[PDB]
Amino acid sequence: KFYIQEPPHGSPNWLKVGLTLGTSVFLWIYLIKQHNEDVLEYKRRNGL
Amino acid sequence: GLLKKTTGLVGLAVCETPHERLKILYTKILDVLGHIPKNAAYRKYTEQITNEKLSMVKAEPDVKKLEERLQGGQIEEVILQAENELSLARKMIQWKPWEPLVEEPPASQWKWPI
Amino acid sequence: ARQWQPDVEWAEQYGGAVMYPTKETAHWKPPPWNDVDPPKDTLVSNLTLNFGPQHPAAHGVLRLVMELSG
Amino acid sequence: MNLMLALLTNFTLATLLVIIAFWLPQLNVYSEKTSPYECGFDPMGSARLPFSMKFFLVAITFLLFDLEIALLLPLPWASQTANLNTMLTMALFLIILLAVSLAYEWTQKGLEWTE
Amino acid sequence: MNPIIFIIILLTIMLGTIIVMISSHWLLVWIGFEMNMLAIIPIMMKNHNPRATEASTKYFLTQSTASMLLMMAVIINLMFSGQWTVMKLFNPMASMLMTMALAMKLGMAPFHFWVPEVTQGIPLSSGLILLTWQKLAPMSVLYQIFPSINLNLILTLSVLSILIGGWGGLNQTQLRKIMAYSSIAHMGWMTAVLPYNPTMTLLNLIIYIIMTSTMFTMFMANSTTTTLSLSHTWNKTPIMTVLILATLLSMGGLPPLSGFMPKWMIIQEMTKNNSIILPTFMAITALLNLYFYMRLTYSTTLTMFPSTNNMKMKWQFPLMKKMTFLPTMVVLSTMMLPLTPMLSVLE
Amino acid sequence: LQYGPLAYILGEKATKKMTEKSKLITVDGNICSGKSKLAKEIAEKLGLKHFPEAGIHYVDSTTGDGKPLPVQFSGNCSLEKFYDDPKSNDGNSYRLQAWLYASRLLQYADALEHLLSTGQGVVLERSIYSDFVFLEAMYRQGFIRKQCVDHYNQVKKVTICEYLPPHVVVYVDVPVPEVQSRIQKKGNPHEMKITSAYLQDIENAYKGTFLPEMSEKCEVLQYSAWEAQDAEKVVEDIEYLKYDKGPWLDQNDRKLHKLRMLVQDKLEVLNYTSIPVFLPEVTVGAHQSDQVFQEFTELPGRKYRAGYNEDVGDKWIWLK
Numbered sequence A: 001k002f003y004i005q006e007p008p009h010g011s012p013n014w015l016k017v018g019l020t021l022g023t024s025v026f027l028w029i030y031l032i033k034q035h036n037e038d039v040l041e042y043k044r045r046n047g048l
Numbered sequence B: 001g002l003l004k005k006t007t008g009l010v011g012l013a014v015c016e017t018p019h020e021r022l023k024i025l026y027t028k029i030l031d032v033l034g035h036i037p038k039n040a041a042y043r044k045y046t047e048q049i050t051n052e053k054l055s056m057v058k059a060e061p062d063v064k065k066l067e068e069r070l071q072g073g074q075i076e077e078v079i080l081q082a083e084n085e086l087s088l089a090r091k092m093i094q095w096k097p098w099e100p101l102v103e104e105p106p107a108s109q110w111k112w113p114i
Numbered sequence C: 001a002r003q004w005q006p007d008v009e010w011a012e013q014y015g016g017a018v019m020y021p022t023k024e025t026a027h028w029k030p031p032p033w034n035d036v037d038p039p040k041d042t043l044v045s046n047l048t049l050n051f052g053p054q055h056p057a058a059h060g061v062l063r064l065v066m067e068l069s070g
Numbered sequence D: 001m002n003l004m005l006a007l008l009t010n011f012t013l014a015t016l017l018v019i020i021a022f023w024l025p026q027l028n029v030y031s032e033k034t035s036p037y038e039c040g041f042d043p044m045g046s047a048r049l050p051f052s053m054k055f056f057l058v059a060i061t062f063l064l065f066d067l068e069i070a071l072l073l074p075l076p077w078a079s080q081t082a083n084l085n086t087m088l089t090m091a092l093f094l095i096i097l098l099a100v101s102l103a104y105e106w107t108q109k110g111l112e113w114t115e
Numbered sequence E: 001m002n003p004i005i006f007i008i009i010l011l012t013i014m015l016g017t018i019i020v021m022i023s024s025h026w027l028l029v030w031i032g033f034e035m036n037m038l039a040i041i042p043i044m045m046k047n048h049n050p051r052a053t054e055a056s057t058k059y060f061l062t063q064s065t066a067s068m069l070l071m072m073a074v075i076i077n078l079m080f081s082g083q084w085t086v087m088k089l090f091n092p093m094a095s096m097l098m099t100m101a102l103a104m105k106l107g108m109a110p111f112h113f114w115v116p117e118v119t120q121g122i123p124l125s126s127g128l129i130l131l132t133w134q135k136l137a138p139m140s141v142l143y144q145i146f147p148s149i150n151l152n153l154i155l156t157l158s159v160l161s162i163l164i165g166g167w168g169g170l171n172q173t174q175l176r177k178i179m180a181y182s183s184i185a186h187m188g189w190m191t192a193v194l195p196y197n198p199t200m201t202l203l204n205l206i207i208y209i210i211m212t213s214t215m216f217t218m219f220m221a222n223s224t225t226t227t228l229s230l231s232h233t234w235n236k237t238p239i240m241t242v243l244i245l246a247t248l249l250s251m252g253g254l255p256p257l258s259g260f261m262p263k264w265m266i267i268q269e270m271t272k273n274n275s276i277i278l279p280t281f282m283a284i285t286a287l288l289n290l291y292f293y294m295r296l297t298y299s300t301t302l303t304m305f306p307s308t309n310n311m312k313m314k315w316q317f318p319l320m321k322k323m324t325f326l327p328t329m330v331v332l333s334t335m336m337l338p339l340t341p342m343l344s345v346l347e
Numbered sequence F: 001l002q003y004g005p006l007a008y009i010l011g012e013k014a015t016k017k018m019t020e021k022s023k024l025i026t027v028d029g030n031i032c033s034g035k036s037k038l039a040k041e042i043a044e045k046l047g048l049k050h051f052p053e054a055g056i057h058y059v060d061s062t063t064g065d066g067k068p069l070p071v072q073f074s075g076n077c078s079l080e081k082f083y084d085d086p087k088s089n090d091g092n093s094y095r096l097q098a099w100l101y102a103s104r105l106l107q108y109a110d111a112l113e114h115l116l117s118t119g120q121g122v123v124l125e126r127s128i129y130s131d132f133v134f135l136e137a138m139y140r141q142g143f144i145r146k147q148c149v150d151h152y153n154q155v156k157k158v159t160i161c162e163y164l165p166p167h168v169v170v171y172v173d174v175p176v177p178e179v180q181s182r183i184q185k186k187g188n189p190h191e192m193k194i195t196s197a198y199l200q201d202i203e204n205a206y207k208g209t210f211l212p213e214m215s216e217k218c219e220v221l222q223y224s225a226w227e228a229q230d231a232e233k234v235v236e237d238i239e240y241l242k243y244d245k246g247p248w249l250d251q252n253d254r255k256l257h258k259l260r261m262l263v264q265d266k267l268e269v270l271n272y273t274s275i276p277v278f279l280p281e282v283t284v285g286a287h288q289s290d291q292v293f294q295e296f297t298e299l300p301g302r303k304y305r306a307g308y309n310e311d312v313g314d315k316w317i318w319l320k
């Protein structure tokens, strides 16, 4: 139950949580712009 | 009085709190002497000289003045002697030299010249 | 009848030094639990030297028997 | 040739002196005379017994330091290079790393002899 | 060992491997090998007990001898070619000496005797470095000189490694000796396909490293080094036993697990070269590896061996080992067969 | 920042926190010798952390809600059952002794962690170093087999090597006839069945094996019953000690970093308490083991790692 020693993970580590969410979001943006700019290069090069 | 830097004797460290250390050791000696019979000359003599040394420690708060009164060298030498006396008192309980002479010597054991 | 599970006799099949005993491995023991073998009981021997009597630093008649390590 | 002649003469003279030393003097050989010396009393054990080295760690470090000189001895020739910018950087780099290795062993008590 | 010293030494081990892999000059390749051996011995000796001392000495003697033969090959190559470039060797005697030198460095049979003993004598973390990272540098050199390697010599080592690795594992109860013999067997597959398609040597190497890294990481997690010590895992961490089972079956090459891929791809390459008898022999002999993987799954996951009373005290404490990358490696160790065509990236 | 190599690299080194009040004191003596009362006084006067002697439920107090767990989660080892039938067939005698040693080993690690992490000294009542006295008395009385004694030595041989002995060993030396009297006054019915031979085996183990060994590497203080009465006298002796021997003088930062890395990971500490040596006394089969283990995880706040149990009020689990 209520712990005699406070757990190491009793409270969220808000710094990791902020970074972890920021990394996931950052990569998704980078992947979408990267993908969207690969299509235009592919379309431009092949006459599309 | 400012604390010493050296006792002058090699291997004898300077004591930071001599008054308290002496009171502890003199009290312990008096405690150990309580287990020796009241009639033993070791108890009566050691208690007497112990109580005189303890009375000095309680009445002279200056280490320089106290050393002059105790006449036992540097106050760290006095602490060492107190420790030696306490060691002796415990040994004397086992030995019990207040008992009567264990054995007379032969007739002429100490006669000189022959 | 409840499901059989390995007992001590079964488990000890896997606790030896080897799975298949042979005469050449009869003297093998399992290694130490924590990988530490006992230090040797062997005593390292110190060099014993006569320092004097016939020696400039012995005053001519001191036989100083020294045990040296280096 | 000259060098080989010079070396042969040097060690030929030394050998001749040893030969003379061994065959000129009158000899009187017996067991007590040739027994091992140890201040008048018999040796206690063999002189071939192990003799502990207290400076063993310095001795190994000497092997590594003793090869720094081979890398540094070409420096007088390297100073004649056109590319002095690269030289001086690399020469100073080697000596500093040698100095750092010495400092590390020093600060970690590697130069203290074992008791 | 000061933590900073451990990192610098650990970075030097990687540096030597990287120097071998990026070097175009035989001298720098040899230097990279020496740098690697210099930095790994202190990791082997980390715990300073007689067994670790024995392992480090046996390792040093083996690796030093290989370096001598390797450098001898380089100088012979220099005599008969006047150049130092890392590539095919111009003298068949130089090819034999280098091939044997690399075989000792890998621990291939019959130069295998040191692998079981060194692995058993050192901690699990050190054994992980020895059986995974230390394979990269010698394999990368073999990947460049293979056009001049004698076919009979390289295939002879591969066949012997698979047999000796397979038979050696059957008698082991220590997990570090099981991983050593398993490593010897897997090295045989890598070099067997080397003359035909070097890409499948890289594929087998990577997949072997992922699966070996996972097994060592799970052994470290529960601090188990024997078959019986591992048999208690079910009573503390049930999940771990299931991961050990899946990883072990994958190491045995059972479809549809990732470990089947390198064996599958290597058989394809060998048959394309009308090599039928050898892949058939290899695949069957690898059943020896599966047999002593299946024993471990029996004592670990599919049955329950007896425990001890003191085990109850461990129920109250959580695992605190890092277990770095373990969730990712085990997924890669098991669920990659659907992605097999991705092997073309190695081309 | 959980302690590790990085925290050490950043300046969390033991030498920065120790003093001359950072000592590890152990109080020893036979049964009913006044250990626990003396131990509390020493800690109060010196400002040290007091550790009540480790019992069957010591590990319980350091985890969960701190309450004792049902005895099935300890193998049903029973101290009272040991005193009533010391020769029971189910191996209670050694199962208790093996469990108690592992409890002391866990406590010793917890004490060392507190000493190294905070620099505050601690006081213990017995320890892994003196637990063997009951092992010796049990065997000499025929309460355990010779096989059990060898098992105990194996576990101790691979566990006690990784630690440092206490700075100071206090020993309250009470004669056996006095203990037999004090046990009567105490009122514990089971404890009153202790025989004199057993107590004389504990005294013999102590005075003959423990104290000589501790003398060679620890400051050993011994006291009578009457001296032990006044903890002020005992504290005075401790405060004027020399500390000129033992391995604590040879410790440096990197060595204590390695020690701290061990004692903070409790599973690593307890690793060899469960070596697969199948004694009948301590062995348990899968069906019993599996059944109790499933019960253990059903206990409140025990199914998940501490901080991840909703049934005991832990929150933000989807962000942890």
Ligand SMILES: CCCCCCCCCCCCCCCCCC(=O)OC[C@H](COP(=O)(O)OCCN)OC(=O)CCCCCCCCCCCCCCCCC
Pocket: E238, E239, E241, E242, E243, E245, E246, E249, E256, E257, E301, E302, E330, E331, E334, E335, E336, E338
């Ligand atoms: C899709 C393409 C890829 C195709 C390849 C195949 C994909 C599968 C690869 C699997 C990869 C490994 C991951 C497996 C996850 C297993 C999860 C599981 O079985 O439950 C764990 C359970 C834990 O038990 P519990 O105590 O309740 O919880 C503690 C953990 N919090 O554990 C237990 O309690 C069980 C203990 C008894 C052991 C039972 C052993 C027999 C059943 C094992 C089933 C899994 C077999 C995996 C082997 C590969 C199968 C293909």
Ligand SMILES: CCCCCCCCCCCCO[C@@H]1O[C@H](CO)[C@@H](O[C@H]2O[C@H](CO)[C@@H](O)[C@H](O)[C@H]2O)[C@H](O)[C@H]1O
Pocket: D084, D085, D086, D088, D089, D092, D093, D096
């Ligand atoms: C832990 C690693 C430690 C690494 C430490 C490395 C220390 C190296 C310090 C720099 C040493 C050389 O420093 C550099 O020397 C060359 C001379 O050779 C100088 O160069 C100067 O002289 C050269 C020729 O002599 C001219 O061509 C050039 O026009 C002029 O700039 C540079 O102005 C100076 O910056």
Ligand SMILES: CCCCCCCCCCCCO[C@@H]1O[C@H](CO)[C@@H](O[C@H]2O[C@H](CO)[C@@H](O)[C@H](O)[C@H]2O)[C@H](O)[C@H]1O
Pocket: D095, D096, D099, D100, D102, D103, D104, D106, D107, D108, D109
């Ligand atoms: C680029 C070349 C020139 C640069 C100099 C390179 C060499 C530097 C040598 C190391 C200097 C610092 O490292 C050295 O560490 C030891 C720790 O044992 C220090 O302290 C020690 O040194 C001296 C002599 O041994 C002892 O009297 C002292 O008791 C001890 O504490 C030294 O005072 C310090 O000099």
Ligand SMILES: Nc1nc2c(ncn2[C@@H]2O[C@H](COP(=O)(O)OP(=O)(O)OP(=O)(O)O)[C@@H](O)[C@H]2O)c(=O)[nH]1
Pocket: F029, F030, F031, F032, F033, F034, F035, F036, F037, F053, F079, F082, F096, F097, F100, F131, F134, F191
């Ligand atoms: N078999 C066994 N019994 C133990 C052990 N430690 C304690 N006990 C028993 O647990 C009870 C309490 O131990 P003690 O502290 O020595 O007895 P006590 O009444 O508290 O006497 P004090 O020293 O004054 O505290 C006693 O019955 C001991 O015999 C042990 O390691 N093994």
Ligand SMILES: [Mg+2]
Pocket: F035, F036, F053
């Ligand atoms: Mg008590």
